[PDB]
């Protein structure tokens, strides 16, 4: 690989130089002859696999605190090596855990919100042993991160994987999501993205209200045991009813959304250790709700009803009735969150912040891996500055990774 | 290995085998993806490239290994020997030009690829000849508004000192003028090219929509200026179907999009002058040409006339104005019966095209970064379509601007 790589911004002519790609660890999926940049997704570590992975992370940590090569650095290396020898695994210090989690966010090429990466509140839940205890930790996470609408980014980290038969898992894909119910006639009530998980909950004992916006229960697995159901206390679930500053009829659509986006199905990898339950939360970019959740055809799919109430001609695509309604929906989402004082960022502000963040990372870190396909927002892409910014994508560790859905792998007791 | 692509909206899965036929590089490696980077012979090298292309041509007409196939291979071999190059048959030129379009991973309009009028201009020797060929192209492709796809192919490169080049980036474009007070009148994308035309003698009208002259280089000589006859240049005044004040913005655009700075590569031969044209997708004018900060940059003016609150980004005033501008563009072209396609229809056609190509050909190289439209991405079907990008030949390639290589 070449030592310096240049990226250009085609609207400002700014050229940045990346050297950080030389620390790339895992594979992108691309080759010299094919690029998999738009592919959405392109039994443990042995003692011998673990040694070099831990040393790499420990070296990186001691370099970050300006103590590389120090007595404490060499001592930590030796203590980790011994621990891997006698137990075939090792435990992270609290300092290392916090550094690792922050950097997994810093390295997340698909995240436009990373200017905030260093202000992550890390909750250490490695002492947790039961699903009730997981429920307690998650309730505390939700209450802290919500903060009455002044949202704060946070992560809660449950015990790492050991032999793969004792995984901690949150079976929910996000901590707060709405149920979906398939009907005998083929229609769907609620959120069509969550139909599979809803059916699982119902099979596990959940009594479904069968409404349009039913907060799903938590389904929590500790130490490889069968998962258990818990209802989040509704006073902890902050929600925003959606209304429009101009269209009085918009509130009559009965739409609302939850304030806290909190991913709970990813895997956090630090120094070769695997934290399979590590729910993390931030705050929304408006388009995640107003474009994807609401206007995706396989989601709530409200473009038609909004367009009807806007009295647009919906017979010709070239009237751009979809585009016109999509903007108003996103105007309403941003207006409703700001009116209720719940943190939210519009796509113009977020992408301008990300450009400033990326320039700082190139200057102070030597690069910033970024996945253009994910960074550019799903509406008005080219009137945001990220559209014109060349990006390099590569995988640094620590990182957040996808993992198989737990119902596909769990050995029922 | 067989590679699968999934559409996440329809859950349709396609299987790609065609990528096994590529050997040009993408720029990516196993460790770094450059998918959002815009730009990442001899007798010795020529014959294998020639043979590959002849092979796929005779394989395409189902006479692979025929006597005609055998004879052409040896004919081409003797010619690369005795002349250091070779000349394509007419049938081969047409096939190679259609397939360069079919292979253009960044083009959402490829459902049309085999409806392409190919104009053979390989006997051209002077800039006057190029001008005549180009005027004929423009008149044919414009067709009084019923636009027809076309390409004109000038003589191939020989030693690199005798290149044919269209110095314009598109056949029809608007001049851009650096103002004394610091700003820009016209189109800022073209400020440099406009200055070169003035430096070469063109008398600029210093307006907002001044059609640039053609600047044409033949056989490596200095380029020459030519005015396209105005009756050949079809233009559309932009008005809005509800905002009657929109026409008072004074906006217009040309109907014929015609790229003239790329390089066409067929069987290892390089055609440095190959202007090709089709018809517009509305967002090309309404989103990029009008609203890029480094282009005409009219969002502020439009949002003014709509009386939108412009103090905070979160009112989405930019997004509102953007949609109205794009409604006006489509409405104006359609009212004047000038061919144009909206991004919803275009991307729908491209998904259908992908389906056709997977069935009959085993895949379709496609660049998601370029295929997805610059507005309303995820409400178009391409947003949810996984795509494999790879380089098949014949192809269109970028080349350096001639004013950085030419010696006068
Ligand atoms: C603080 C405000 C934040 C904002 C505005 C934000 C914004 C976003 C957005 C818009 C996406 C694309 C989401 C999608 O289309 O599904 C994304 C992806 C992602 N974010 Fe952030 N995020 C924030 C906080 C966080 C935090 C705290 C973490 C982890 C510590 C994080 C990690 C990620 C990851 C891993 C992805 C990619 C996951 C995937 O591949 O699906 N984000 N973010
Ligand atoms: C017939 C109607 C056509 C439509 C609607 C169409 C649409 C488009 C659009 C919207 C783009 C992106 C352009 C940009 O963002 O600057 C594009 C790219 C491209 N088109 Fe098509 N196109 C058409 C015809 C053609 C023809 C006839 C050719 C060649 C014979 C062609 C070759 C290309 C190439 C090579 C690119 C990629 C350019 C690059 O790499 O920068 N297109 N097309
Ligand atoms: C922490 C946070 C901030 C924010 N603004 N939005 C979210 C929800 C969107 C989102 C992510 F960001 C990251 C990951 C997922 C889930 C991965 C799903 N993959 C397979 C499409 C996600 F759905 C989370
Ligand atoms: C044939 C045709 C149909 C259509 N719809 N639009 C156009 C103009 C846009 C366009 C292209 F398509 C292809 C290439 C360029 C040149 C882009 C500049 N390079 C340096 C990125 C272009 F600017 C041409
Ligand atoms: C940096 C990035 O590659 C660049 O802005 C690309 C992105 N996608 C694009 N897509 C199209 N259709 N046209 C473009 O000019 C671009 N520009
Ligand atoms: C096929 C394609 O990769 C898929 O639709 C991706 C595109 N980009 C995205 N970008 C974001 N932010 N979120 C997404 O879910 C997707 N989906
Ligand atoms: Zn790639």
Swiss-Prot record, chain A:
<feature type="binding site" description="axial binding residue">
    <location>
        <position position="111"/>
    </location>
    <ligand>
        <name>heme b</name>
    </ligand>
</feature>
<feature type="binding site">
    <location>
        <position position="373"/>
    </location>
    <ligand>
        <name>(6R)-L-erythro-5,6,7,8-tetrahydrobiopterin</name>
    </ligand>
</feature>
<comment type="similarity">
    <text>Belongs to the NOS family.</text>
</comment>
<feature type="binding site">
    <location>
        <position position="174"/>
    </location>
    <ligand>
        <name>L-arginine</name>
    </ligand>
</feature>
<protein>
    <recommendedName>
        <fullName>Nitric oxide synthase 1</fullName>
    </recommendedName>
</protein>
<feature type="binding site">
    <location>
        <position position="288"/>
    </location>
    <ligand>
        <name>L-arginine</name>
    </ligand>
</feature>
<comment type="subunit">
    <text>Homodimer. Interacts with DLG4; the interaction possibly being prevented by the association between NOS1 and CAPON. Forms a ternary complex with CAPON and RASD1. Forms a ternary complex with CAPON and SYN1. Interacts with ZDHHC23. Interacts with NOSIP; which may impair its synaptic location. Interacts with HTR4. Interacts with SLC6A4. Interacts with VAC14. Interacts (via N-terminal domain) with DLG4 (via N-terminal tandem pair of PDZ domains). Interacts with SLC6A4.</text>
</comment>
<feature type="binding site">
    <location>
        <position position="402"/>
    </location>
    <ligand>
        <name>heme b</name>
    </ligand>
</feature>
<feature type="binding site">
    <location>
        <position position="387"/>
    </location>
    <ligand>
        <name>(6R)-L-erythro-5,6,7,8-tetrahydrobiopterin</name>
    </ligand>
</feature>
<feature type="binding site">
    <location>
        <position position="38"/>
    </location>
    <ligand>
        <name>(6R)-L-erythro-5,6,7,8-tetrahydrobiopterin</name>
    </ligand>
</feature>
<feature type="binding site">
    <location>
        <position position="283"/>
    </location>
    <ligand>
        <name>L-arginine</name>
    </ligand>
</feature>
<comment type="function">
    <text>Produces nitric oxide (NO) which is a messenger molecule with diverse functions throughout the body. In the brain and peripheral nervous system, NO displays many properties of a neurotransmitter. Probably has nitrosylase activity and mediates cysteine S-nitrosylation of cytoplasmic target proteins such SRR.</text>
</comment>
<feature type="binding site">
    <location>
        <position position="284"/>
    </location>
    <ligand>
        <name>L-arginine</name>
    </ligand>
</feature>
<feature type="binding site">
    <location>
        <position position="374"/>
    </location>
    <ligand>
        <name>(6R)-L-erythro-5,6,7,8-tetrahydrobiopterin</name>
    </ligand>
</feature>
